[PDB]
Amino acid sequence: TVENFLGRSACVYMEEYKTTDNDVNKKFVAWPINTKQMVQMRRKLEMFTYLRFDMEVTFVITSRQDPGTTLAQDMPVLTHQIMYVPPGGPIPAKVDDYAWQTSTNPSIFWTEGNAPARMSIPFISIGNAYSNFYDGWSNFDQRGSYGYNTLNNLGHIYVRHVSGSSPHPITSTIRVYFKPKHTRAWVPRPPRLCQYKKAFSVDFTPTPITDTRKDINTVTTV
Amino acid sequence: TVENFLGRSACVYMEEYKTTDNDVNKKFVAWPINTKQMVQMRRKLEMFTYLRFDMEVTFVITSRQDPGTTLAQDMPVLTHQIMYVPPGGPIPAKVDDYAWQTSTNPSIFWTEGNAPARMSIPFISIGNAYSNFYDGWSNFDQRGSYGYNTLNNLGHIYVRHVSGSSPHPITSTIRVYFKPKHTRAWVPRPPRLCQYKKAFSVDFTPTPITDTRKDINTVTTV
Amino acid sequence: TVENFLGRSACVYMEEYKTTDNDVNKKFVAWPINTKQMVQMRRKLEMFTYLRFDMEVTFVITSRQDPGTTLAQDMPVLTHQIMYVPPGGPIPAKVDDYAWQTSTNPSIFWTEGNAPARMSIPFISIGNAYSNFYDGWSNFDQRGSYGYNTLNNLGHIYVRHVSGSSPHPITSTIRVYFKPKHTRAWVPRPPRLCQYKKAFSVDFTPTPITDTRKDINTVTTV
Amino acid sequence: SDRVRSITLGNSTITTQECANVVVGYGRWPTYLRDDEATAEDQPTQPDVATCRFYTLDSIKWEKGSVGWWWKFPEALSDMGLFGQNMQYHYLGRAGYTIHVQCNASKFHQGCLLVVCVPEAEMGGAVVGQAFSATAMANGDKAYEFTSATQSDQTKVQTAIHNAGMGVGVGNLTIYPHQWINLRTNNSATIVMPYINSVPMDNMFRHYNFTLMVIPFVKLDYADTASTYVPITVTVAPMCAEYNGLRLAQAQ
Amino acid sequence: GLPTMNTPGSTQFLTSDDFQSPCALPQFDVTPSMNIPGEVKNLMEIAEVDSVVPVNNVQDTTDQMEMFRIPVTINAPLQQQVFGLRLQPGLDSVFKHTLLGEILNYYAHWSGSMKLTFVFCGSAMATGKFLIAYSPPGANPPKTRKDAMLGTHIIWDIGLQSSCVLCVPWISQTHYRLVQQDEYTSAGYVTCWYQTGMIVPPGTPNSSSIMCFASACNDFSVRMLRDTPFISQDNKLQ
Amino acid sequence: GLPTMNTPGSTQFLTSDDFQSPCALPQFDVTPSMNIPGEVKNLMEIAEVDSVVPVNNVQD
């Protein structure tokens, strides 16, 4: 059933953020939510043109101490903050900025050693169904952006360590899983044959129909 | 609905306290409860003149080992005590003083690695509703304090490590979240336009109505 | 009852995988699921020719720091991923490869310090019952593979550390337990007398019927 | 017989003496937007007979070596009478269509065409990564053609027929509303497409709702007949056309 | 607190688990549902749809489209073979990339009957009868029409009805076969022969093409979800 | 103890979560409610009120 086929958590993104680093941007993640960067999930969703579902999101966060000459330290357990910033909200420029107050945006505070964080999001499109493809433009002129990317404005996910500055750097990796539930799908399409080349475009390199055999009667293996 | 708009936990305060330091005051936090120091929550509450609600309080406490030349140690898990001192009660002068006995004041003992501490407080005003603004004085004379600060006497929050003296200092940061529930609001006001300058006064710097465009007919972007 | 006799978890496999090593294969486990490598469970199942049951699988994972000259480090808690790859699915060639996305294969993410991971699998044979023995060939010719191994195509189990690269190597050992439940058994056989020699064949070395005594009337011990 | 068919919309009537059936969308007949499915609040125009009538596009030649053609809608009808005029003056539009593909030969000719309507027929560029312009896929009622060879011209779409410009198997296009014109039995194909989109109405210039593809799966062949090419003509009628958001006409 | 005791499995992340979890966007008002045409509920609905089988997937293929055209010609030797294929819908190159084969490749087990529809694409003036058969597994495939006619078959006559359906029944010792088929799980062969011959009147082409479609029947089902061998990557895209 | 198993999401702090938590001031007697005029229940009540639009927001 489509509910069953799509209803398993799949990794849709992963990135690293350090506990301490000279580069401000290496200390937090800023991800523009989408389902086009991880090949497996993408191919499945793309078997349908339109989809409507609620979404279960699970996060798997792991930390490792960076290698170095002096590693002796005794760091207490780490706590992470995952904040969702709907389109247009203030975006954090550094781990310690005001935006992390989340007076209105939804955030999750999670501590290592515990069950992975999780929550449900309802069907949030401004349309009646999510579009996996969009054969059109952003401008009425028939110019601007072309393709599904023009309809992607789900916002961002921002994640940082709470007050985790450690003497020697620790690198955390966050993995985000999506599991659609209460699903409906319309107008099915042929599965993607060519390998994916870009995250935000259908772009591909011609690939042959299938593999070949010596003649039209060959039926043996050797 | 106002219940929904105000009903999300927002950070209203944060401070650090060390496990070991030469300065007595660096080892515990003393906070005069109020909702005027963190800009986001403040702007939301201030959209109404009077408010009446119960309050859910959640604490997020994280610890980090201070950087230094020698960091090798093996410190057991830390336990914190958060005590609420109603106006007039004995205030602690140091981490180890008698006041921490809490025979009557409410306290929470919490150990790191666990779910964040939380509890509910009912509507505790001496008035029929909390006032976000107060156009008046403390003295009948029309002198003394001016403004809402004259009605703020909710008491303090005091927090310390229980018996956490470590060989090398560890710094804990406490973040306190407020989530109003079972809310009622009266006489709505225009949202704050000017940026906030002071925690205990309406004070501001004149800010223009809005941003400008070239002429009254300009409707394009470029 | 057969349900009771077979219904206890038994170790059916164990292997080690390192957190960091120069050899790619030393960092993850790839196991072709079967019940013939651990002698105790094997002898029990083999007391019946055909079996039909659901399966409860429990994993016991433990980690130890490898001995060495410099051992000081402070590694955060480890998280493991156990993925089941049904026959024909993409197999991981290294800890960091795309196959670990599990958009469709079932995986378990588990963190140390917690209750051992566990799940149930239904009766998954393509036949009406699992065969403990198969007196036959793979080819119609009466050639190819001989024996039960020709019917074993349950797939593989792959396990790795999630992002656990540590400065000094840590060795994890995974132990997998099987507990059949909702069992049915047919055509019972004599218990295995000779010790087992191979994982995938009945092969043995002749062993005497039983042990001897001096004469047919000896009934004392000394 | 049932082979006989007559269709009347507005001031035009279509007749066929040798047809198959009439394929209807996904079993969905075109229909005006209901109050419980609308967002745009202004009272719409429903020109009726002036727009919902049959328009015949320029004809094309099916030759022994032809490979296939496509037309994108509503673009293909942008110059057709009041239908085109209404498209220009309105921000939003909505319509279903009766598509009638005509092709007559003789009892001695052989050949077979697939007539399909592909919703959201988003296409790939001739060279991956290289953007192309609208002109590479649609321009009034001009028929675009597929090729046997893979396309090299980066200003074009990847026209290799076996992947239908979409990266899928051309023999699987049958999951979309379609009909076959097998010269041996048919002489035309009629498909009624309802409005299919993820939003209730849409701009008619900026979005090509569906693409009509006519592909020879079995090549045109014949013996010593004086006739050489066999013409293929497409006649289409908008159905239940309604428009919202009137303002000045879009220049093109 | 209520006394509890954690059991094995506690804290693990099983990919196919099915638990509840907190919603990060409390009270989010979902966009109303809309009735879009073409809803799919089971992947078997897709596998039940015909797709063109590349039967003529021979070595010397110059033009890709030729793979879909089965050659048939005039004056063919009596009892000549038209084609032969082995029934491994998920493994053999003839089927693996069709709609049915693609769906099968996300599973490890399959069971059920199949429909192989053949459509004659020559002129209305050509005639012919073909014998299409299915041979359950055995040590040797049929090498002659005489061998083939002993199995399940249908004799196709060309007329107004251009297509013919050979329905290959589920004949197996096990309830399910493996998608990654092996000898134990062997399904047999499907072969086609000239019953009479393709006869033609004057002024018509000398050879013609036959096409083959494949889809699942209503007794068909798949089991054991698995990843497909048909897609991979060496790097993140971008 | 009753056998339990923690699922993903365990121990996390989601800003928009909606759980119960212990009250730090057990048995606190709340000040009685009073009927103040102008109660708001939905922000849309505010958006439904007219405000003056700066239409002539020109450059000079």
UniProtKB/Swiss-Prot annotation, chain D:
Name under which the protein is recorded: Capsid protein VP2
Function: Forms an icosahedral capsid of pseudo T=3 symmetry with capsid proteins VP2 and VP3. The capsid is 300 Angstroms in diameter, composed of 60 copies of each capsid protein and enclosing the viral positive strand RNA genome.
Subcellular localization, as worded in the UniProt entry: Virion; Host cytoplasm
Whole sequence portion shown: 79 to 330 of 2201
Subunit structure: Interacts with capsid protein VP1 and capsid protein VP3 in the mature capsid.
Domain of life: Viruses
